[PDB]
Amino acid sequence: AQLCDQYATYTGGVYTINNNLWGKDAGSGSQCTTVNSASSAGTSWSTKWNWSGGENSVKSYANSGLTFNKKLVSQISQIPTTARWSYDNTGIRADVAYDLFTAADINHVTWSGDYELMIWLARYGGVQPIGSQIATATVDGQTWELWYGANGSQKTYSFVAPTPITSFQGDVNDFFKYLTQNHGFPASSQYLITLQFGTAPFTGGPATLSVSNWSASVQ
Numbered sequence: 323a324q325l326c327d328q329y330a331t332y333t334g335g336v337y338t339i340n341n342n343l344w345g346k347d348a349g350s351g352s353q354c355t356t357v358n359s360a361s362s363a364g365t366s367w368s369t370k371w372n373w374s375g376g377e378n379s380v381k382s383y384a385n386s387g388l389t390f391n392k393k394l395v396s397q398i399s400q401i402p403t404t405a406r407w408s409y410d411n412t413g414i415r416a417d418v419a420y421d422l423f424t425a426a427d428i429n430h431v432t433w434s435g436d437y438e439l440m441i442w443l444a445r446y447g448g449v450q451p452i453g454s455q456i457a458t459a460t461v462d463g464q465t466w467e468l469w470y471g472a473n474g475s476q477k478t479y480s481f482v483a484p485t486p487i488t489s490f491q492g493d494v495n496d497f498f499k500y501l502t503q504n505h506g507f508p509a510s511s512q513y514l515i516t517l518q519f520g521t522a523p524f525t526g527g528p529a530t531l532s533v534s535n536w537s538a539s540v541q
């Protein structure tokens with residue numbers, strides 16, 4: 323599939339790829355997402371974009387998302403994941419990130435949360451998460467800048483890699499554990515509802531993110 327419309331989507335196995343140009347009215351340009359595979363084991367895809375204007379507004383979050391059995395964060399044992407990706411053009415203002423949502427209501431809309439957990443594998447052009455940097459966190463032996471921000475309904479923790487990580491393998495539950503244990507995250511009353519990986523562009527391009535593999539599961 324070739325996904326160019328705002329909410330063009332394709333599912334295969336437990337992976338759903340969404341072009342997700344949720345911010346397209348904030349600027350001028352286009353974006354198309356290509357799915358290479360999407361099976362029970364993993365997905366491969368790419369997205370090519372060019373955006374101008376609205377320089378402090380995100381245009382899109384094209385992504386692959388996992389279908390999983392929703393549960394309380396405190397009941398999760400592991401969220402193993404691998405991500406391998408690259409950009410052809412890094413002269414851009416954008417980031418590459420895991421995006422997860424949690425809500426007290428297990429039927430909450432899946433494009434937002436009571437809480438959000440992001441893990442930024444890269445940022446370009448100095449773009450930053452919502453809020454402020456509140457800590458340096460060491461998670462599974464690796465250091466992340468930890469940001470916390472809120473817009474009055476959604477509270478968002480962003481872990482940011484000091485240098486880009488183009489080949490990631492880890493357990494996302496280590497980050498929830500860290501939040502639960504160190505920042506009072508309410509794991510025992512929050513359902514994990516969404517688990518995605520993709521890129522959030524502000525300005526630049528043409529530029530293409532190639533995701534050679536993304537895999538995840540929730541146990």
Ligand SMILES: OC[C@H]1O[C@@H](O[C@H]2[C@H](O)[C@@H](O)[C@H](O[C@H]3[C@H](O)[C@@H](O)[C@H](O[C@H]4[C@H](O)[C@@H](O)[C@H](O)O[C@@H]4CO)O[C@@H]3CO)O[C@@H]2CO)[C@H](O)[C@@H](O)[C@@H]1O
Pocket residue numbers: 329340342344378380382383417421433434438450451452453478522
């Ligand atoms: O998909 C259908 C649905 O989309 C709605 O729009 C959602 C997007 O789906 C979703 O991906 C997006 O998520 C944001 C999240 O809210 C941000 O917190 C997060 O971080 C931002 C940060 O908040 C900014 O300050 C900073 O500058 O950028 C970072 C990312 O760089 O980013 C994710 C991904 O962009 O939220 C959208 C809602 O705002 C539609 O609105 C809805 O109509 C559709 O049905």
